[PDB]
Design a protein around this ligand. Structure first.
Ligand SMILES: CCCCCCCCCCCCCC(=O)O
Ligand SMILES: CCCCCCCCCCCCCC(=O)O
Ligand SMILES: CCCCCCCCCCCCCC(=O)O
Ligand SMILES: CCCCCCCCCCCCCC(=O)O
Ligand SMILES: CCCCCCCCCCCCCC(=O)O
Ligand SMILES: CCCCCCCCCCCCCC(=O)O
Ligand SMILES: CCCCCCCCCCCCCC(=O)O
Ligand SMILES: CCCCCCCCCCCCCC(=O)O
Length: 582
């Protein structure tokens, strides 16, 4: 186009345009105050409108990169506030845009964003809706400078809807606060999956990524022919490679190009895309990324004919090994939207190892005729774990399910900090509540997605304060083996019990007036410390103490002098437990 800035304004609309411009400037200029950014936005928006009136007007034919970088270099405090970043302005394009990209700070050392009180939030929302939401858009964007800007805007719009509904409710906090909690976790999770995709691309390479994509696209689009899936894998690997590099415009163009291709070829891909493909450009690729799986074709034959029984298996494999393995994966995956992606990848690795071994024998057909037998236990291991865990969950409920997990994992890796053990155990209990309520055919993909978030959060905490070689092994393995590795951890036989600390087991009356969440965390913290100190305690012995503890808190919180109960009765509880455990 003649004026790229005009074309974006016409397509996005003024409101969306202004929000994305704010996000982009805040992700580059993460230390500038909100008011400086509003000013930049308004100046960009009035310039764009001149181009919309006349694509021939001055500087309207410049590229978006040129115009955006020129504008960053007009910021008066650029050297004073960002130092080295200001040297990027001495560069010509495209060197200049690359230089700005390298100086984004993914950990900018800003204070934590505090969630104010419900009445305070709703009153600001009422008083000035636009400034309220845009100031938070700025606060979030500047702390997460690689988060894809359109998706940030998608969250903002759901926040607007939560405040609009809940600030009119009779019980405002009961309406609003679980919505805020859901949006925060979903947002944190989306950021985790973006960073994990990019890190895994770098370490394990393009082929491993393409394998994942084949499985993932074949479950989503089971009616597509392999050649169409395989072209989609190629395009999607380009999109993720460019987006991981971090330039917003290039990432957005690649995503938009792929969505347009999909929507122009729906008959070859899926019957579920009509609604997404009617949406504006801004929303299209995100919508497609979240489409439900297509219904699979009926009466698909077994894989045995093409992959086990054919006389030609080794010949077809040897002439194009990755293509044949891709076809096996495509056929296996389109048939099993109830499997995790990593499960499908385990099966393809197993099939590959067998063909490597068996196509070297004089009778390969005899050698690999049983290969589908090897898949059965790989498939069953995660199915059985889900059954067991969801059963335990319905029998205990989330809290006591969390506690069962807390004791198990403390004993396996008692060197982990107590905060992390509590947090990871709680989040794992949340996975059970979320995914156990799905029918069986959707439980494994649910578990894979949310476990990938929780286990990454663990590996991230641990990578920075490492304490256990066995965790570091599970966190550095292939992502295909990550969960089985964690599932294979055993009780630490060589741990030296932690030395008793009286204060760790001293409880005060503030526990009666704490939040339910903080009371839970308080008790789960002490349960972890209890297992760290007496790791060889039986479940019977632990339950006895947990029951003594429960009577101890309920009694003292109803007693006239509470402070004295907790200290005197408390001393009794400790002395008795110390005798009943070891
Ligand atoms: C990227 C979304 C921006 C839209 C505005 C966010 C909503 C305002 C409240 C945010 C307060 C912190 C949230 C939380 O801690 O749960
Ligand atoms: C957290 C990843 C990007 C944000 C996605 C929007 C929804 C979450 C809003 C609340 C997150 C707080 C951000 C922070 O405190 O750093
Ligand atoms: C169609 C192009 C992709 C070909 C993929 C071949 C898949 C078979 C081997 C899978 C190996 C597992 C991936 C990984 O190591 O993480
Ligand atoms: C940065 C200057 C403002 C205009 C361009 C903002 C970036 C384009 C985002 C909208 C396109 C989304 C495409 C997609 O994700 O499928
Ligand atoms: C880069 C994400 C947006 C690209 C456009 C959607 C193409 C089909 C995606 C199918 C699901 C893949 C999930 C993913 O990797 O985001
Ligand atoms: C602090 C981290 C300690 C180790 C965490 C282990 C994570 C296990 C992931 C799979 C859990 C499936 C349910 C189960 O069998 O417990
Ligand atoms: C905390 C337990 C959550 C529900 C039960 C999860 C059991 C393990 C799931 C295994 C499937 C995830 C992906 C994989 O390893 O194949
Ligand atoms: C040797 C130290 C003994 C300390 C005795 C008190 C132990 C407190 C464990 C608390 C477990 C709370 C579980 C619950 O009922 O929610």
């Amino acid at each position: 186009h003649k004026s790229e800035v005009a074309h974006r304004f016409k397509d996005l609309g003024e409101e969306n345009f202004k929000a994305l411009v704010l996000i982009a400037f805040a992700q580059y200029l993460q230390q500038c105050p909100f008011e400086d950014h509003v000013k930049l936005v308004n100046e960009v928006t009035e310039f764009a409108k001149t181009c919309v009136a006349d694509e021939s007007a001055e500087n309207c034919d410049k590229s978006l990169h040129t115009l955006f970088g020129d504008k960053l270099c007009t910021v008066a405090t650029l050297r004073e506030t960002y130092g080295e970043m200001a040297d990027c302005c001495a560069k010509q394009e495209p060197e200049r845009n690359e230089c700005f990209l390298q100086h984004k700070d993914d950990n900018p050392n800003l204070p934590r964003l505090v969630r104010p009180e419900v009445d305070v939030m709703c009153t600001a929302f009422h008083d000035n809706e636009e400034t309220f939401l845009k100031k938070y858009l700025y606060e979030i964007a500047r702390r997460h400078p690689y988060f894809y800007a359109p998706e940030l805007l998608f969250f903002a719009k759901r926040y607007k809807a939560a405040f609009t509904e809940c600030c009119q409710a009779a019980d405002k906090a009961a309406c609003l606060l679980p919505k805020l909690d859901e949006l925060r976790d979903e947002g944190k999770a989306s950021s985790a999956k973006q960073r994990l995709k990019c890190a895994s691309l770098q370490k394990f390479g393009e082929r491993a990524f393409k394998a994942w994509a084949v499985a993932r696209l074949s479950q989503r689009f089971p009616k597509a022919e392999f050649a169409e899936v395989s072209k989609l894998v190629t395009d999607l690997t380009k999109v993720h490679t460019e987006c991981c590099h971090g330039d917003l415009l290039e990432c957005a163009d690649d995503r938009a190009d792929l969505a347009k291709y999909i929507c122009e070829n729906q008959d070859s891909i899926s019957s579920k895309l009509k609604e997404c493909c009617e949406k504006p450009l801004l929303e299209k690729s995100h919508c497609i990324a979240e489409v439900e799986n297509d219904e699979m074709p009926a009466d698909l034959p077994s894989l045995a004919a093409d992959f086990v029984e054919s006389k030609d298996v080794c010949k077809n494999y040897a002439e194009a090994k990755d293509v044949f393995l891709g076809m096996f994966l495509y056929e296996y995956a389109r048939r099993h939207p109830d499997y995790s992606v990593v499960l499908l990848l385990r099966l393809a690795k197993t099939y590959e190892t067998t063909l490597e071994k068996c196509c070297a024998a004089a009778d390969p057909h005899e050698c690999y005729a049983k290969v589908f037998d090897e898949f059965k236990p790989l498939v069953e291991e995660p199915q059985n774990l889900i059954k067991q865990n969801c059963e335990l969950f319905e029998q205990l409920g989330e809290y006591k399910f969390q506690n069962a997990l807390l004791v198990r994992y403390t004993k396996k890796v008692p060197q982990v900090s107590t905060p992390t053990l509590v947090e990871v155990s709680r989040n794992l209990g949340k996975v059970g509540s979320k995914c156990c309520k799905h029918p069986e055919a959707k439980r494994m993909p649910c578990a894979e997605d949310y476990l990938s978030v929780v286990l990454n959060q663990l590996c991230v905490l641990h990578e920075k304060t490492p304490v256990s070689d066995r965790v570091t092994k599970c966190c550095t393995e292939s992502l295909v083996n990550r969960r089985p590795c964690f599932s294979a951890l055993e009780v630490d036989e060589t741990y030296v019990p932690k030395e008793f600390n009286a204060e760790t087991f001293t409880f005060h009356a503030d526990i009666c007036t704490l939040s339910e969440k903080e009371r839970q965390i308080k008790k789960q913290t002490a349960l972890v410390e209890l297992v760290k100190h007496k790791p060889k305690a039986t479940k019977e012995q632990l339950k006895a103490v947990m029951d003594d503890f429960a009577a101890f808190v309920e009694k003292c919180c109803k007693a006239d002098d509470k402070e004295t109960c907790f200290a005197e009765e408390g001393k009794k509880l400790v002395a008795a437990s110390q005798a009943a455990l070891g």
